Structure formats: structure tokens, C-alpha cells
């Protein structure tokens, strides 16, 4: 709830509009950084080690801007999902994972922002004010000057890293939180069915059926909300793993500047997490319907009122189909997709390595 509340406020779901203005400011900053990086790539003269850094920065900014747009475009659906989730919480394991991911994002953002300074207080061949002494690419129109201007540019560039990490945490924690809401409501439905199979209470079974239908509607809303971020993460992570592995291999071979790993190690660590969270908790959904299916099969089925039996059989038919998180008409979000992504990543890596060498 630490980051979920911030996500809801800055998405505009809550009444407070100030966080919506903060989201607008972050979008404007990301757009300016994207256009500045594009201008540096095209309408400027830069070296190869700077071309690769600029390409990585442009990709990161494009992904962050797309994520901001995706979460702003679905504010009403996110509001409906929060309204559903207001009643029950989430499993404590999900909350522990959310806390772990929030702490990781804080630590990683603070480390990546800091490291340029350490690299400038080391490797005496380099000095403050030139290509890799900033968390971001040197895109500001101002030139290198005294330490005051250096620090101002450093903070302005670190704002971009903090924004990227905030928007990555928002998509990493919300999927877990809402899958946990789904799971908790599913277990409550199973418990209600178990209670109904103790008193021949057909009315309580009707209540369980209503709860299951509402859960299915909420699941459809969740699919609608998370369809776009998941596809973006999938495709970008594939091509980005390829590109960043190529860059790491080249820099290990010494073709390019080694300090580029400072991004490649970090911007692919925050990527392998994004597709791991989606594919992991996307495979926990398919175990949910088995709980209802195995709680419906009971000896008490043989003592109920012959219309209770029909309802049991109808739900039993409906729960033989697992909850598949299909997005993009082709892609089912589970660990099999995690297996499948790596092969395309390796193909891209081999193509890039052969072209570079």
C-alpha cells in the first residue's frame, strides 16, 4: 500500500489532483529528454561510445513515456480495480514481495545516480564534465563549467533516473498487488463454497456464484488494464536483452568504452525483473481455478436438493478452464513465455554480434 497509494494518486484515480500534475510534469520531462536524445543522435556529431549510450537513453525514455501514457489512459479501469480491491487485502507473501521490490528500486536508483560521481573520483584519465560523468547523457544546452553548473546538471539528469525507477516500480508492484487481490478473493470464494457444503445452503452457494462472477469481471478488467504494459515489456525486453548483451560482450572485448556497463548492468537488471514478475504471477492465475474445481467435488454433492446439484455442475464446468492472462491475441503470460523470450533474445544477440564484428 506504500507504492500502490502513490500509483493511485499519480494516476488520477483519487480525488487529489496534485499528484496528477506531478505525473504531467514527469511526462513533460520524459518527452523533453526523448527529443533531446533524438536530436543528439541525429543532429549532432558524436562517437560510437556516445551513439550507443544515446541509443540506450532514448530507448529507456521511450519506454518510460509509454508506460506513463499507458497508465494514464486506463484511469477509470484502474479506479474500478481499486474499488474492487478495497474490501479484502492481499496475501502476506505478495506484500513481502512488494516491499522487497520497492526497497530494491530505491537502492538501485540511488546507486545508479551516485555511481557517475565515483567514476569521476576514480580513473584519473577522466575528469568531471565529459561523456560518462553524468547519470544521463549530456544533452543540456549548457556547457561544462565550474562545480556548481556540474552539480545542477547532475541533479537535472538524476531526476530522469528517479522518474524511470518510479515508473518501473509502479508497473512492477501493481501487477503483484492486483493478482494478490484476485487470489485472496478466490480463496474467500472457496471458503464460502466449503461453508455451503455444510448446511445444504443453496442460498450461500448462490452467493458464492455471485462472488465468482464478480471475480471474473474483475479479472477481465485486470486484463484490460495490463494488456499494454505487458506487451511493451515483452517486446522491449527481448530486443533490449539482445542489444545490451551485445554491448556488454563488445565492451568486455574492449571495442567500446567499458563504463557503458554501468547502464547495461543496470538497465537490463530492471528489465529482467519486469518480465519475470509478469510471467511468474501470470502462471499463479492458472492454479486458482483448480481450488474451486477440487472444492466442488465433495460427498455433500450427493445429499443436496437436485437444483443445488445443477449449480454445482455449472460452476464445475466453468472452473475446468484455467484463468489465462492472454494479451495481444497470441501471448499467454506465464513462465513458458519467459522460456520462449530468451531464444529471440539470443537470435538478436547473435545478429548484432556478427554485424558488429
Amino acid at each position: 500500500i506504500d507504492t500502490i497509494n502513490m500509483f493511485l494518486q499519480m494516476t488520477g484515480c483519487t480525488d487529489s489532483k496534485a499528484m496528477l500534475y506531478l505525473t504531467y510534469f514527469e511526462f513533460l520531462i520524459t518527452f523533453y529528454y526523448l527529443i533531446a536524445t533524438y536530436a543528439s543522435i541525429v543532429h549532432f556529431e558524436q562517437s560510437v561510445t556516445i551513439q550507443l549510450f544515446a541509443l540506450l537513453c532514448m530507448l529507456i525514455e521511450c519506454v518510460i513515456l509509454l508506460n506513463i501514457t499507458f497508465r494514464l489512459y486506463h484511469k477509470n479501469h484502474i479506479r474500478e480495480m481499486h474499488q474492487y480491491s478495497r474490501r479484502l487485502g492481499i496475501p502476506d507473501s505478495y506484500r513481502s514481495v512488494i516491499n522487497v521490490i520497492t526497497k530494491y528500486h530505491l537502492i538501485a536508483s540511488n546507486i545508479f545516480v551516485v555511481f557517475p560521481v565515483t567514476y569521476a573520483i576514480f580513473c584519473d584519465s577522466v575528469r568531471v564534465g565529459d561523456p560518462f560523468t553524468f547519470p544521463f547523457l549530456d544533452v543540456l544546452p549548457m556547457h561544462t563549467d565550474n562545480l556548481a553548473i556540474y552539480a545542477c546538471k547532475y541533479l537535472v539528469y538524476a531526476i530522469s533516473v528517479y522518474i524511470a525507477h518510479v515508473e518501473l516500480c509502479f508497473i512492477n508492484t501493481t501487477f503483484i498487488y492486483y493478482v494478490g487481490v484476485l487470489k485472496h478473493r478466490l480463496e474467500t470464494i472457496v471458503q464460502t463454497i466449503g461453508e455451503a457444503f455444510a448446511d445444504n445452503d443453496e442460498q450461500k452457494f448462490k452467493y458464492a456464484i455471485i462472488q465468482h462472477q464478480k471475480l471474473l469481471s474483475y479479472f477481465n478488467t485486470m486484463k484490460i488494464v495490463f494488456s499494454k504494459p505487458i506487451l511493451l515489456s515483452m517486446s522491449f525486453n527481448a530486443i533490449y536483452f539482445g542489444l545490451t548483451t551485445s554491448f556488454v560482450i563488445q565492451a568486455i572485448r574492449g571495442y567500446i568504452n567499458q563504463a557503458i556497463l554501468s547502464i547495461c548492468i543496470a538497465s537490463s537488471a530492471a528489465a529482467v525483473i519486469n518480465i519475470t514478475i509478469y510471467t511468474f504471477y501470470g502462471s499463479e492465475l492458472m492454479d486458482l481455478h483448480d481450488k474451486i474445481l477440487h472444492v466442488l467435488f465433495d460427498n455433500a454433492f450427493f445429499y443436496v436438493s437436485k437444483s443445488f446439484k445443477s449449480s454445482i455442475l455449472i460452476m464445475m464446468t466453468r472452473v475446468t478452464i484455467p484463468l489465462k492472462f492472454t494479451v495481444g491475441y497470441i501471448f499467454t503470460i506465464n513462465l513458458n513465455l519467459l522460456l520462449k523470450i530468451l531464444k529471440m533474445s539470443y537470435t538478436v544477440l547473435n545478429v548484432l554480434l556478427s554485424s558488429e564484428t
Binding site: 471474473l216 445443477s310 449449480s311 455449472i314 478452464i321 491475441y329 497470441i330 537470435t347 538478436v348 556478427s354
Partner: protein
């Protein structure tokens, strides 16, 4: 006319005017009219296949380099789609007539007439939009084919008849297609006749191959809209069986509504089976030709440098070949999804507080509407976006392998 014929009247009229061997859906069944129609269709077929044979002849008798062979094979296989589809429709009209006549005497139940009219209007609008898009794409392709012929040098790579192993560029007629002719198509009236004939041939072959795809996608659009209509009327049908404060009249009303729903769903299932029987092997032939087309086009794309006529030609060939596959893959996928969602719609209604007959109906619907309705191409593959994704992935992988190895 009435039923599916009235909805697809522009398609059938364009098919009749295009020159395909179609005999039904006329209003002038007289000897003179029938003879004129047969003569026109036979003239169209003769011209089409003669020009195809001509462009095949100017593919083995005037090809020296492997690049020239690749380009000629790409063009020949590109128009082999229309060549196959013309004879597929011409000699297989019985299946199309059976498919077009399934929704002939069906009438909506008086309780669900408003919803049926709404979804019929939606289906008509979708069909008209598809027709407009197909016509625009065909006209744009025909225009660009004539436009790209004037942005290059009309030269041909022929072995030099003086030296041993040298090759020279000979001036060639500037036409839409490389094709041999009995006459001299290099200048004058021969050149004008060749250009006019090639323009007509390209336009009408694209028209044939696109009218087939448009008819298939319109069939699928109608099936999907009927499935949507069935999905939407489940709530009133179940509420009809509610025991709110059942008599004989209510029982017979609910039985009639259930009968209407079941009959319409069986109509949809039989209609999809008819679509598969009619346009099933056509998809198989299309995929067989497009596999070779896309392999050779990936190879051609590996040789793209800069911006010139070759890059534009290869990109256009690749885009048209992928759009043709996407057009029917998207509608097959939509049919699959909308047939699979019927159980989800039938479980989401207020069936718990319904009569025993309503519960039995919901249970049987959930049992059957669990396997999606699939249009399969000659029993080899399922038409869906999975096929399009597999084709695209195979093409991209082959292109990457060719770039890396070569």
C-alpha cells in the same frame, strides 16, 4: 434478394462485373444475356492466363543472373495467387452458393428482434468498411505499380556477345511487367497496347485475389456478429425463466426462446463448417505460394541498400504479401475468440435464480461452447493470428540468418 445475399450484394456485383465464372444472382436469364456473359468471362480468362504465360516465358528465356531469376519468380508467384483463385472460384461456385444461402429463411424471435436488427446493422457496416478498404488498397497498388516503372532505368543484364564472361545492359521496354509478346512491344502501337494490357491485367488480377479474400472475411464477419447477437440475448432469455412473483404460458415462452437460441447457434456452427469446406483449400494454396514468396522476398530484402526502386519494390511486395495473410488471420482469430467467449457470457448471466430448463440450457451451452469454432485451411492449420505470428517469426528469423551467414 434477401438474407446474406442482400448484405453481400456489392461483393457479388463486383464479382459478376470482374469476369469470374458466376451464373446465379442475375435478373436477365435470357439466351442472349447468358451467351454475352459467358463470352465476356471466357475472354477475361483467356487474357488473364495468356498474360500469365507471357510473364512466365519472360522468366526462364531471358533470365541470366540469380537476382533476375529471383525477381521473376517473385512476380510470377505474386500473380499465381490470382491465377489459382480465378480457377478456384470459377469451378467451385457450388460451395460459395451453399455458404451464401445458409441464412436464407431465418427470422429473429420477436423477443430478440431489436438486438438482431442492431447486430445486423453492425455487420453490414463492418462489411462495407472492409469493401472500402479492399478497394482503396487495390487501387493504390495498381497506381503504385504504374508509378514505380517510371523511376528507374529500363535496362536488362544480358551476357556480352563479344567478350567471354562479361555482361552488358540492354535497353528494355518500360512496362509494368517483364513479359514476352508475339508482337514488338518496344515502341509505338505495340508499346501502347502492351502497356494498356498490362495495366488491365494487373488491376483485374488484384481484383480477383482481393474479392476472394474480402468474401471470406465478410463471411467471418457475419458469423462473428451472429455470435455476438447470441451472446447478448442470453440475459433476457434467462430473465424470462425467472420465477419472480412458472405458468404454462411462461414455460412455453421460455422453451421457444431456448429453441430459437439453439437453432441460431447450430446455424452459426454449420455456417462455419460451410466456410471451411468452401474456402479451406484456397487458404492452403495461398499459404503454399506465400511461403516461397516470403522466403525469396527475405532474400531480396537482404540485398537492399539505400533508397531506390529495388528497395521500394521489395518493401511493397513484402507488405502486400503480409497484409493478405493478416486479412484472413485477423478474422479467423476474431471468430475463434467470439466463439470461445460464449461460455463466459452464458456463465455471467443470472442463471442461478432461473428455472430448471434454463439451468439445463446453460449447462449444455457451457459444455459445447468450450471448444472454439475454428476455420481450418484444408485441415492443415487453423486460421488465426497464431498463424500470422508464426509466419512473421519464420520470415524474420530467415532474414536474420541470411544477413548473419552471408
Amino acid at each position: 434478394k434477401d438474407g446474406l445475399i442482400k448484405d453481400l450484394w456489392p461483393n457479388i456485383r463486383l464479382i459478376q462485373l470482374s469476369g469470374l465464372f458466376i451464373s446465379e444472382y442475375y435478373d436477365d436469364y435470357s439466351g442472349l444475356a447468358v451467351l454475352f456473359r459467358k463470352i465476356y468471362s471466357w475472354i477475361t480468362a483467356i487474357i488473364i492466363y495468356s498474360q500469365f504465360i507471357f510473364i512466365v516465358i519472360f522468366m526462364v528465356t531471358k533470365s541470366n543472373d540469380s537476382d533476375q531469376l529471383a525477381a521473376g519468380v517473385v512476380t510470377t508467384l505474386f500473380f499465381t495467387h490470382s491465377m489459382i483463385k480465378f480457377v478456384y472460384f470459377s469451378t467451385g461456385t457450388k460451395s460459395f452458393y451453399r455458404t451464401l444461402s445458409c441464412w436464407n429463411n431465418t427470422s429473429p424471435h420477436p423477443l430478440f428482434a431489436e438486438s438482431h436488427s442492431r447486430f445486423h446493422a453492425k455487420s453490414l457496416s463492418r462489411m462495407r468498411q472492409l469493401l472500402i478498404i479492399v478497394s482503396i488498397v487495390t487501387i493504390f497498388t495498381t497506381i503504385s505499380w504504374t508509378t514505380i516503372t517510371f523511376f528507374g532505368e529500363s535496362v536488362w543484364k544480358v551476357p556480352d556477345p563479344e567478350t567471354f564472361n562479361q555482361t552488358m545492359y540492354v535497353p528494355v521496354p518500360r512496362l509494368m511487367l517483364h513479359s514476352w509478346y508475339p508482337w514488338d512491344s518496344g515502341h509505338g502501337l505495340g508499346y501502347i497496347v502492351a502497356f494498356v494490357l498490362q495495366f488491365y491485367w494487373v488491376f483485374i488480377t488484384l481484383s480477383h485475389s482481393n474479392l476472394m479474400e474480402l468474401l471470406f472475411s465478410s463471411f467471418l464477419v457475419h458469423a462473428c456478429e451472429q455470435l455476438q447477437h447470441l451472446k447478448e440475448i442470453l440475459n433476457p432469455l434467462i430473465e424470462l425463466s425467472a420465477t419472480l412473483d412458472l405458468t404454462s404460458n411462461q414455460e412455453v415462452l421460455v422453451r421457444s426462446a431456448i429453441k430459437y437460441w439453439v437453432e441460431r447457434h447450430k446455424h452459426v456452427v454449420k455456417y462455419v463448417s460451410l466456410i471451411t469446406e468452401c474456402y479451406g483449400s484456397a487458404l492452403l494454396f495461398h499459404m503454399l505460394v506465400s511461403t516461397v514468396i516470403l522466403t525469396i522476398l527475405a532474400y531480396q530484402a537482404t540485398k537492399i541498400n539505400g533508397v531506390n526502386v529495388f528497395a521500394f519494390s521489395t518493401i511493397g511486395y513484402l507488405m502486400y504479401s503480409f497484409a493478405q495473410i493478416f486479412m484472413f488471420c485477423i478474422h479467423g482469430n476474431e471468430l475463434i475468440e467470439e466463439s470461445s467467449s460464449v461460455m463466459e457470457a452464458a456463465y455471467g448471466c443470472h442463471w442461478y435464480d432461473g428455472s430448471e430448463e434454463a439451468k439445463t440450457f446453460v449447462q449444455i451451452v457451457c459444455q459445447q461452447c468450450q471448444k472454439p469454432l475454428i476455420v481450418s485451411g484444408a485441415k492443415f492449420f487453423n486460421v488465426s493470428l497464431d498463424l500470422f505470428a508464426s509466419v512473421l517469426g519464420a520470415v524474420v528469423t530467415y532474414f536474420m540468418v541470411l544477413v548473419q551467414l552471408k
